[PDB]
Structures are given as structure tokens and as C-alpha cells.
């Protein structure tokens, strides 16, 4: 009995607490949980960017965050349970019970990490690191593994924090082909630390429509602070879903081999600020954008870039309303550690992301286009100023990663 083909009655959730939410050719439910996840994405992204200086890059995987906190929700109760449901917009899947969310989440994960005879690799790993001394709830243990594949590995936080820390770090690294390293700095993890919950997500894809390295050239890129810098600009001409939306902003979709996952770029006209577009980027607008796209012939100028980012999510989430989970006095996670211990709370939550974009990904290729003549009045998309980037799974309308490229220069 595996969850990917299962019906809800085949998977008894038996959650300690339950919250009742108020008020195409894909699964209706996993599509709603998708709408939920994206709602969290743009709102969270809006906050994150507003707390950021305009000349800084931003990269993160909102799906990773939602998954990690959904894993945590499994043992949440009362108001900790409600805030989680509201903050992550799971409560917006009308009348559905908080327990149902996890079934849906598992269904969404099954599709996403298909592992079929595909061309792009999208992998995910989750895991629980509990102190060997503690005794975890049998149900929490079971469900975390059934719904999220998260296994529970015993570690010695009490005596060997440093050794435990290296074990975890080694694990994330391995599950991210080495792109996410020392997630846990030598400082954190002590003795008071009883549980380290972790989600990883890894993606690698090749362009369906090639950017020949031979065409890449240094070009000026215009930062928000009015100055310039030298970027490696990739170039090609060909058909791409595109659309010039409000106030001259250009939305472009670059698919990966398999067409299942794409890269979406949002480039405001030179006159307008990305901050202004960030502020107006509503979940419904973004969906509207994405749905109005149409195949077209254009010239593409896109820098090659590598972005590495990391930050604590605590403060951001608190502003959005996730307060109890972080308060040792208000936090209610009675479902996690078996036998009392009511005062378990999240001390901190960290996100670390990596993004590399270029030709061929990982030089040795070229492209020859013979006998082509395009309209001298073709649409051009020149990303030499700040723009937003998204990496999405189209059939599932899932935002896997998002960010902002304020500075691609070295």
C-alpha cells in the first residue's frame, strides 16, 4: 500500500489535532494545494524582497519551505496549528481538514518527483534528526515517513553536537550534489537541541532551445544603483512563449528538455523599477501573466549567473503571522516527542539556496541555423537590468524556485 496510488481511506492520518478550514485534467485537490503553495510563495517573496536592498540577488525554493513547515505541522496543535495553516495558505483549500492537506501534499510530491523516463532531474529528500535519548511519537514518526519519505535518524546532540552537525551537513550536501554545504554552522546545535527537521530539493535541467556558448559575449548590466558592470550575455533567436503585459513588462518562458519544467523571466521596461513590479506581484496577477503567454519569435539576451543565498526565516514568518511556533511559552507541538514535554518550540529555521544558469549547464557545443530570415521588426528581450526568475513545474502549476537577478556580474 503506497501513497502514490492510494485513496484517502487507505492512509489513516491519526493526527493529534485537527483544524477545520473555513468557507486542466489534473487532480482537483493537488491543484488546490498548488494554488496554496504559490500564494505563500509570492507573499513570502514580497516580504523577503521588501526587507532586501534592491542591488541584492535573492534565491530560494518556496516549495522547500512549505514542505518543511508542512512536516512540522504534523505535530502541531491549537494556535500553532492554526497559524501554520493560515500562514502557508493551506486554510484556503475550503472546508478541508488540516489532516487532509498532507494527503494532498504527498500526491503533489508524487507527481513532482516522478523519476520517470524524463530529461530534467527534480529530486527531493526529507529527514528527521532526533536526539537518540528522546522517544518520538510512533504516529509522528510513521506519518512523516509515509507522507514525506522523511526517515528518523538518531543523533547524539547532547554529547556530540559537533559530530551530529557534521552528519547532517554531510547529508544535505549529498542530497544536493554538493551545492548546499554547511547548512548548520559550527555554532548551533547544542544539547537543548532535540530535533533537526530537514527538506532538500535538487534540480538540474538542460535548455530545450540551445544557447550556443559561441554567441555569449561581455555586455553591460545596469544595477539599481544607477551604475554598470560587465556580464556574460547569452544569446539566441527562436520561438518562446512570451507576452508583453502591463506597462511594458516582458514575461518570457524558457522551457527545459521534457517541457515539464520551465524558467520564467519577468523584465520590467527600463523606465520602471523592479521594486515597483515586486510590490504589484500578486498571486493572481502572476497566474494571469503565466496564462496569457503565447508562442512567438524573439531575440533573447540573458546573462549567465550564479546566485547563492541564505537567511533565517524566523523574522519573516513572524511578521506574516507565524508566532506561536517560535514562542517557548505559546508553542504547541505535542505530537512530536512522545510523553509530555509540552514546551517544544522552533528555535530557528534556515533556508539556503543555490542557482546556476548558463549554456549546457555543467565549451563543447555550437549551433548552426541555416536558411533563416526573421522579421526585422522582431520582439527583443534584453535582460541587462534587474529581473525576476522562476523555475516551475507547468502541468502542476508549482513554483519550485524563485529569485531576483539584480546583479549577474562577477
Amino acid at each position: 500500500v503506497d501513497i502514490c496510488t492510494a485513496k484517502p481511506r487507505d492512509i489513516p492520518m491519526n493526527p493529534m489535532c485537527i483544524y477545520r478550514s473555513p468557507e486542466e485534467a489534473t487532480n482537483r485537490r493537488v491543484w488546490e494545494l498548488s494554488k496554496a503553495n504559490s500564494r505563500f510563495a509570492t507573499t513570502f517573496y514580497q516580504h523577503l524582497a521588501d526587507s532586501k536592498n534592491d542591488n541584492d540577488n535573492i534565491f530560494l525554493s518556496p516549495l522547500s519551505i512549505s514542505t518543511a513547515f508542512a512536516m512540522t505541522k504534523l505535530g502541531a496543535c491549537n494556535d500553532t496549528l492554526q497559524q501554520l495553516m493560515e500562514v502557508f495558505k493551506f486554510d484556503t483549500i475550503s472546508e478541508k481538514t488540516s489532516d487532509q492537506i498532507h494527503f494532498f501534499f504527498a500526491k503533489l510530491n508524487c507527481r513532482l518527483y516522478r523519476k520517470a523516463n524524463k530529461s530534467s532531474k527534480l529530486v527531493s529528500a526529507n529527514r528527521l534528526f532526533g536526539d537518540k535519548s528522546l522517544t518520538f511519537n510512533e504516529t509522528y514518526q510513521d506519518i512523516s515517513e509515509l507522507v514525506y519519505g522523511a526517515k528518523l535518524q538518531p543523533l547524539d546532540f547532547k554529547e556530540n553536537a559537533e559530530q551530529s552537525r557534521a552528519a547532517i551537513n554531510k547529508w544535505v550536501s549529498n542530497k544536493t550534489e554538493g551545492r548546499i554545504t554547511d547548512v548548520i554552522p559550527s555554532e548551533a546545535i547544542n544539547e537543548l537541541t532535540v530535533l533537526v527537521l530537514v527538506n532538500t530539493i535538487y534540480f538540474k535541467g538542460l535548455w530545450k532551445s540551445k544557447f550556443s556558448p559561441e554567441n555569449t559575449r561581455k555586455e553591460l548590466f545596469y544595477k539599481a544603483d544607477g551604475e554598470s558592470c560587465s556580464a556574460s550575455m547569452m544569446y539566441q533567436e527562436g520561438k518562446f512563449r512570451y507576452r508583453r503585459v502591463a506597462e511594458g513588462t516582458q514575461v518570457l518562458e524558457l522551457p527545459f528538455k521534457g517541457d515539464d519544467i520551465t524558467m520564467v523571466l519577468i523584465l520590467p521596461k527600463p523606465e520602471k523599477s523592479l521594486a515597483k513590479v515586486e510590490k504589484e506581484l500578486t498571486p493572481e496577477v502572476l497566474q494571469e501573466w503565466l496564462d496569457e503567454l503565447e508562442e512567438m519569435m524573439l531575440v533573447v539576451h540573458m546573462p549567465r549567473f550564479r546566485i547563492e543565498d541564505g537567511f533565517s526565516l524566523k523574522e519573516q514568518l513572524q511578521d506574516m503571522g507565524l508566532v506561536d511556533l517560535f514562542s517557548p511559552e505559546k508553542s504547541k507541538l505535542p505530537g512530536i516527542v512522545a510523553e509530555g514535554r509540552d514546551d517544544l518550540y522552533v528555535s530557528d529555521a534556515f533556508h539556503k539556496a543555490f542557482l546556476e544558469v548558463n549554456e549546457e549547464g555543467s565549451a563543447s557545443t555550437a549551433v548552426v541555423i541555416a536558411g533563416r530570415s526573421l522579421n526585422p521588426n522582431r520582439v527583443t528581450f534584453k535582460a541587462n537590468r534587474p529581473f525576476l526568475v522562476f523555475i516551475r513545474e507547468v502541468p502542476l502549476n508549482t513554483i519550485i524556485f524563485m529569485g531576483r537577478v539584480a546583479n549577474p556580474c562577477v
Binding site: 550534489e177 551545492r179 530537514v198 532538500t200 527545459f256 533556508h351 543555490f354 519550485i400
Partner: peptide, 7 residues
């Protein structure tokens, strides 16, 4: 593109 994250 190559991307990874951990939370």
C-alpha cells in the same frame, strides 16, 4: 540551470 535548496 542547476538549483538546490534546503530548509
Amino acid at each position: 540551470s542547476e538549483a538546490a535548496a534546503s530548509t
